[PDB]
């Protein structure tokens, strides 16, 4: 397939696919380096501005994959033209961290901060160095420090939430996800994650909040089945708890039964695709019947 793939492509499509990969910031270092070094030996003629980003991406992938030789090969090419560039310094520091002797990388970051006071990338890389070197508490403190000094980056908020997830701190992650959702209200993914975080907390009021947040993002995309499943189980759990009112429990049963029918239709519309989908449809059917009998 390697020769077959290399045959039925052109350099334009390959470059466009690499640009799309950059846009989707996926983790495909193997394929990135596979298509990276191939276009560096086949075309190697024009598109300098594109090929510099390509060089950096290929070296980033090679740092992940297995190959420091190509990483240094692209590093010398990057250093040839721009003698003083802080991005290349950051990249070299990252590779140095990957190899050994983290302290000289820290010193390089310190010098970079001494030159340019406003360098978020170097501080982020130092925060990541102490995420893996020491405990996550100190890294959390420093990430909070940098975030307080900026209060600009959404990636910092999401990283803080991710690090707080491992510490079973849903109270602070709740605020993190609330802030990250406030800036982007049309992104249903953050709403779904916030609903899951609030559901994990527990409590009937938190259950209702998570249910409503599940149902809000359910109409923005109208296809995510994780949120619909979470809403159905939130309604079932509300029904289970004795501390409830008659009409609220009634409407919760209606919500759960409606979600069950939507599940049934979603799985029945997939049965005409293949011939093994009928069996999975049966399986989810027994699941829903058991849950319906138990709820009723």
């Amino acid at each position: 397939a390697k020769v077959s793939e290399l045959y039925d492509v052109t350099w334009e499509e390959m470059r466009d696919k690499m640009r799309k990969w950059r846009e989707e910031n996926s983790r495909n270092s193997e394929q990135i380096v596979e298509v990276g070094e191939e276009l560096i030996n086949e075309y190697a003629s024009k598109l300098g501005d594109d090929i510099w980003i390509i060089y950096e991406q290929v070296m980033i992938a090679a740092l992940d994959y297995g190959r420091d030789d190509l990483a240094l090969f692209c590093l010398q090419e990057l250093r040839r033209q721009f003698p003083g560039s802080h991005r290349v310094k950051r990249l070299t520091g990252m590779r140095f961290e990957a190899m050994e002797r983290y302290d000289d990388a820290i010193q390089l970051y310190d010098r970079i901060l001494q030159e340019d006071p406003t360098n978020t990338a170097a501080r982020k890389r130092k925060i990541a160095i102490r995420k893996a070197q020491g405990k996550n508490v100190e890294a959390i403190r420093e990430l909070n420090e940098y975030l307080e000094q900026f209060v600009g980056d959404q990636e910092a908020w999401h990283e803080l939430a991710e690090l707080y997830i491992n510490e079973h701190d849903y109270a602070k992650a709740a605020f993190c996800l609330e802030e990250l959702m406030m800036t982007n209200p049309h992104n249903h993914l953050y709403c779904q994650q916030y609903a899951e975080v609030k559901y994990t907390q527990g409590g009937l009021e938190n259950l209702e909040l998570s249910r409503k947040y599940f149902a809000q993002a359910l109409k923005l995309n109208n296809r995510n089945m994780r949120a619909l499943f979470g809403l159905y189980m939130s309604a079932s759990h509300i029904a289970s708890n004795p501390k409830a009112s008659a009409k609220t429990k009634k409407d919760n049963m209606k919500y759960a039964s409606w979600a069950a029918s939507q599940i049934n239709r979603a799985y029945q519309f997939a049965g005409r695709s293949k011939k093994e989908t009928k069996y999975s449809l049966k399986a989810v059917e027994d699941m829903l019947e058991t849950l319906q009998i138990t709820q009723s």
């Binding site: 006071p117 406003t118 000094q149 900026f150 209060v151 600009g152 605020f175 609330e178 959702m181 406030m182 800036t183 209200p185 909040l209 409503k212 947040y213 149902a215 809000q216 359910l218 109409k219 109208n222 296809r223 919500y255 409606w258 939507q262 239709r265 979603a266 519309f269 997939a270 695709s273």
Partner: protein, 258 residues
């Protein structure tokens, strides 16, 4: 149609002038890009900008947020005991704009005096060709524009339709005004008329002229705004239909795995 002209004056005046103004505009745009220099930004001002953006985003998107957390945000901003905006105070520069003077200045400044450099170019071009007839404009004109239009031909019986090179280039300036953006893009800075006028998107959007006053203004704006949980209305989706998830699910089969 009269005044039979030579075929040598059209190939030595029209084309040269057109190319001259085209390349002058392009050169002006490129030089404007080259001369653009960055402005130094200090960390405290950056933080002030980010806090302003945060408060503005809270003002805009405040419906899809829990009431308890919204009140916690608003208290943190207001906080009558300490107050972030109340205590944090930077240096203040003495102002000078006044109500009536600035209300008038809004029009006094304007862009009134931005035509003179083009007039200089037109004057040089007209100086080069003293007695010349470039073209005629089909649009009928009044005889009171002839002094400005001809400006160098001694003719009182002739109509004002026949224009000189000065007005020819003057109309050439605005003829390609919307054509320059066609090859460059929406943000075009090749306008020959506005030479000295700086036209750009603008480095460093945030301009906290008086940090304290902006702090107080945002403090009162956040006190004025109310809270209306737009999430409380979930019953509209309750009674509905789900057919779009049937929608591209049909069109999600057709794509395989690379």
């Amino acid at each position: 149609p009269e005044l039979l002209l030579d075929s040598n004056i059209r190939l030595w005046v029209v084309l040269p002038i057109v190319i001259i103004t085209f390349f002058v505009g392009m050169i002006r745009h490129y030089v404007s890009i080259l001369l653009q220099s960055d402005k130094k930004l200090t960390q405290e001002q950056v933080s002030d900008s980010q806090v302003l953006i945060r408060s503005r985003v809270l003002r805009e998107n405040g419906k899809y947020i829990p009431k308890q957390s919204f009140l916690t945000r608003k208290y943190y901003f207001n906080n009558p005991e300490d107050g972030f905006f109340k205590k944090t105070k930077r240096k203040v520069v003495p102002p000078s704009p006044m109500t009536d003077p600035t209300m008038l200045t809004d029009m006094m400044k304007g862009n009134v005096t931005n035509v003179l450099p083009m007039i200089l170019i037109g004057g040089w071009i007209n100086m080069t060709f003293s007695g010349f007839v470039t073209t005629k404009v089909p649009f009928p004109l009044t005889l009171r524009f002839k002094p400005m239009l001809q400006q160098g031909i001694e003719l009182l019986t002739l109509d004002a339709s026949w224009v000189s090179s000065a007005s020819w280039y003057f109309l050439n300036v605005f003829g390609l005004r919307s054509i320059y953006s066609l090859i460059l893009g929406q943000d075009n800075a090749a306008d020959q008329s506005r030479m000295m006028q700086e036209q750009m998107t603008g480095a460093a959007m945030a301009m906290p002229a008086d940090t304290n006053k902006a702090f107080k203004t945002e403090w009162e704006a956040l006190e004025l705004t109310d809270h209306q949980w737009a999430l409380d209305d979930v019953e509209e989706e309750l009674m509905a239909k789900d057919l779009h998830f049937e929608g591209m699910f049909k069109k999600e089969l057709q794509t395989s795995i690379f």
